[PDB]
Design a protein around this ligand. Structure first.
Ligand SMILES: CC(C)C[C@H](NC(=O)c1ccco1)C(=O)N[C@@H](Cc1c[nH]c2ccccc12)C(=O)O
Ligand SMILES: CC(C)C[C@H](NC(=O)c1ccco1)C(=O)N[C@@H](Cc1c[nH]c2ccccc12)C(=O)O
Ligand SMILES: *[C@@H]1O[C@H](CO)[C@@H](O)[C@H](O)[C@H]1NC(C)=O
Ligand SMILES: [Ca+2]
Ligand SMILES: [Ca+2]
Ligand SMILES: [Ca+2]
Ligand SMILES: [Ca+2]
Ligand SMILES: [Ca+2]
Ligand SMILES: [Ca+2]
Ligand SMILES: [Zn+2]
Ligand SMILES: [Zn+2]
Lengths: 416, 412
């Protein structure tokens, strides 16, 4: 299971009603451009060791499914909410942008949550159809996505050469394709230090909706392999320019592809996480590490210390350990009553602003309590809270709150 | 010149139990304390650490705290003594109480985890478990390693076929070796939570125990010292005479280029700011000058700040440190939640207890910064973690007005 240096943003573009009428209804033409923007956005991000892959296009040729308002802050929280409640529940994807004809107040031609990549709500960005030039619109797209990647503007002695850089204070008439030194650092700081696990997988060709394109470094339909331009290709299994495999190779992609041949059967290709993570192994007859399989969510795991959840086994014990280190354990039940106060630290589910208190049963599903015996600092009900992320130190969704019960969204709901 | 090592400046406090046990022979106790401290420096070398005994206090009259058999009491009591008494009249990084009175849950040692340099918590307690110096020494090494965020050797950390310093339990025949985990954790805690109080190198005169040749600590009567002749790697000093070999000039301190002097203008000390007048050497100077600063209050940085202990603290620079780029100084109006008296909003502390700011001292408690993150707009964002309520307080010495500044929670 080799380590991929790249990440991948499985993008989802939405196009507003406004934008459509601009284009006289030509749905096919829109699609065509959204396919092209995508490839320029992936071109651009390559410097950052990142790819951009269009896994969904949804044109509101019917009508805007949210009110697209001139004030760009309302509109963004609005698109972020629809992204989460409607789009996400219908389609898997990492990041969604909204292209629009609507004139924003600023004037602002782009607006996007900082360091949000992968956040169920905030991994989003609004983008003005600020020009017919695709190089321009794509630069804006890549720019906002950069903000999501937690990149801030260039300042001071940031450089991308003697051209206009992507995260420059403001856009040029004749824009370049170049992120800046400052951008590359800030972006990889965000990955290293926030880890958006969701951009980790290479998207499958079937998964991608743009006409397959050879040399974009995205394996796609009809391609036997892809490894960029002839000048960049390190894959001696692949004819960079024709995207077909070379002579004897049975493969030129995947974790189950060695030298150029298929991986021996039994060859582990996806390491197990926990006991809710059955390992995967190569078929001996294919080129890709077989799909990932977990156990039955809710399965007695860890000598019945926990009930499974997405391949892992969340037990209060480990949760303490992470927060508070060696020799610290689960606290007295009494400690959890502080969850009903509904204050800065004690609660269950923040809904979209306020801190909702805990139900006297749901108290084992808010802020966590641990019995810290750190000499000279013994404290029965040790708790953890930073407003640097109020989630650090809340019980993980999936944790036993009793027997035959788990914490689902603030609640100690029932198991089955 | 960057120094790998850190230097624990240890202070030992000996209790009454001990004293009676030695029938009051102080001249003796002193002698053993010196030995212990030396043994404890040997041990530590592996962590690239040193222990230097810069203080020793035998309670041969009164006992300065009622050391109870509840180690946790004795410990918090002895910590408060350290900081509200001992530390007032003696500079020192870490302190240890050797007792001869037995503690409860059969306890030979007791120390704060990762407490190194803490005004109150930089201490540990060790028990007169044994006449055997090396046995006692090791407890001291141990409860120090605790002080340093070092944990019990889990289940398979190793150090040869010897019992290791941070083993679950002590053996009948201890050894001077720290385990690999220990090296790791040590420096993680040092890297991560860097304690500044162990960076300076003890002056030879800062040390109270009889100078030693080949202990890796420059002292009085020594020209240089670089440990055993087996470990001494600078070809400038005979590591047994400690007075430099054939025609060597110097051998320690920054200003010594392999066995000889530096020269003039040669910058010698860091310069945190413009409030730190670099200081260079001169040749004829075997070492570096004393760290000159700037008469506190000397205007600095476009007239946004006034100096302090070497740096130049301004509100803005302090928002950027906590929150990153694009987060600037908040309007005075936010700072007003510092008279609220609540978990985040005070101006200082009297006794565990928080004092709300007077309207006057307001830009002198919790910090507030303007954060316009799209979708997450917050005009008066501040930092608060129960890991350290102090993280986010305005920095002791920061400009809060034309001419006025912050000190111990006031704009004055
Ligand atoms: C407050 C407002 C003025 C910020 C801008 N608006 C514009 O820059 C604009 C409108 C018409 C001409 O310029 C904004 O929308 N900022 C956006 C877009 C942006 C900022 N820098 C670059 C560089 C390259 C491409 C796009 C952008 C932003 O994302 O910050
Ligand atoms: C409650 C009690 C059993 C905890 C131990 N006690 C002992 O270690 C002990 C009692 C009689 C003989 O040994 C404790 O507080 N230990 C200390 C000191 C310690 C533990 N392991 C090592 C290894 C090397 C040096 C010192 C120690 C501790 O801090 O854990
Ligand atoms: C960016 O690169 C240029 C190299 O020309 C350098 O001058 C500039 O200061 C660098 N700054 C950062 C933050 O990398
Ligand atoms: Ca993905
Ligand atoms: Ca391709
Ligand atoms: Ca699996
Ligand atoms: Ca010191
Ligand atoms: Ca010496
Ligand atoms: Ca200076
Ligand atoms: Zn921007
Ligand atoms: Zn211990």
């Amino acid at each position: 299971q080799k380590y991929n240096p790249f990440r991948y943003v499985e993008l989802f573009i939405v196009v507003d009603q406004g934008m459509v009428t601009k284009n006289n209804g030509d749905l096919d033409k829109i699609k065509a451009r959204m396919y092209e923007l995508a490839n320029i956005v992936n071109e651009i991000l390559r410097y950052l060791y990142m790819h951009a892959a269009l896994v969904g296009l949804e044109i509101w040729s019917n009508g805007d499914k949210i009110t697209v308002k001139p004030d760009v802050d309302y509109t963004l929280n609005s698109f972020a909410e629809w992204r989460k409640t409607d789009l996400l529940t219908r389609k898997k994807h990492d990041n969604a942008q909204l292209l629009t004809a609507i004139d924003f107040n600023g004037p602002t031609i782009g607006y996007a949550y900082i360091g949000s990549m992968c956040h169920p709500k905030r991994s989003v960005a609004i983008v003005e159809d600020y020009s017919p030039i695709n190089l321009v619109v794509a630069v804006i797209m890549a720019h906002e996505m950069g903000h999501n990647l937690g990149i801030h503007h260039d300042t001071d002695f940031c450089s991308c050469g003697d051209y206009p850089c992507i995260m420059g204070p403001t856009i040029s008439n004749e824009p370049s394709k170049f992120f800046s030194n400052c951008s590359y650092i800030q972006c990889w700081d965000f990955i290293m230090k926030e880890n958006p696990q969701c951009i980790l997988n290479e998207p499958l060709g079937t998964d991608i909706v743009s006409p397959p394109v050879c040399g974009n470094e995205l394996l796609e339909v009809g391609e036997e392999c892809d490894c960029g331009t002839p000048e960049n290709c390190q894959n001696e299994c692949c004819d960079a320019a024709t995207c077909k495999l070379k002579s004897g190779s049975q493969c030129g992609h995947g974790d189950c592809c060695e030298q150029c041949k298929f991986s021996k059967s039994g060859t582990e290709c996806r390491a197990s996480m926990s006991e809710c993570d059955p390992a995967e192994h190569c078929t001996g007859q294919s080129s890709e590490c077989p799909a990932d399989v977990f156990h039955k969510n809710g399965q007695p795991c860890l000598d019945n210390y926990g009930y499974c959840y997405n391949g892992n086994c969340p037990i209060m014990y480990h949760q303490c350990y992470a927060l508070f280190g060696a020799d610290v354990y689960e606290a007295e039940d009494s400690c959890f009553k502080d969850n009903q106060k509904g204050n800065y630290y004690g609660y269950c589910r923040k809904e979209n602003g306020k801190k909702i208190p805990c139900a006297p049963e749901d108290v084992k599903c808010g802020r966590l309590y641990c019995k810290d015996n750190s000499p000279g600092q013994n404290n029965p009900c040790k708790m953890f809270y930073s407003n640097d992320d109020e989630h650090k130190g809340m019980v993980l969704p999936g944790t036993k709150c009793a027997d035959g019960k788990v914490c689902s969204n603030g609640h100690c709901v029932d198991v089955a």
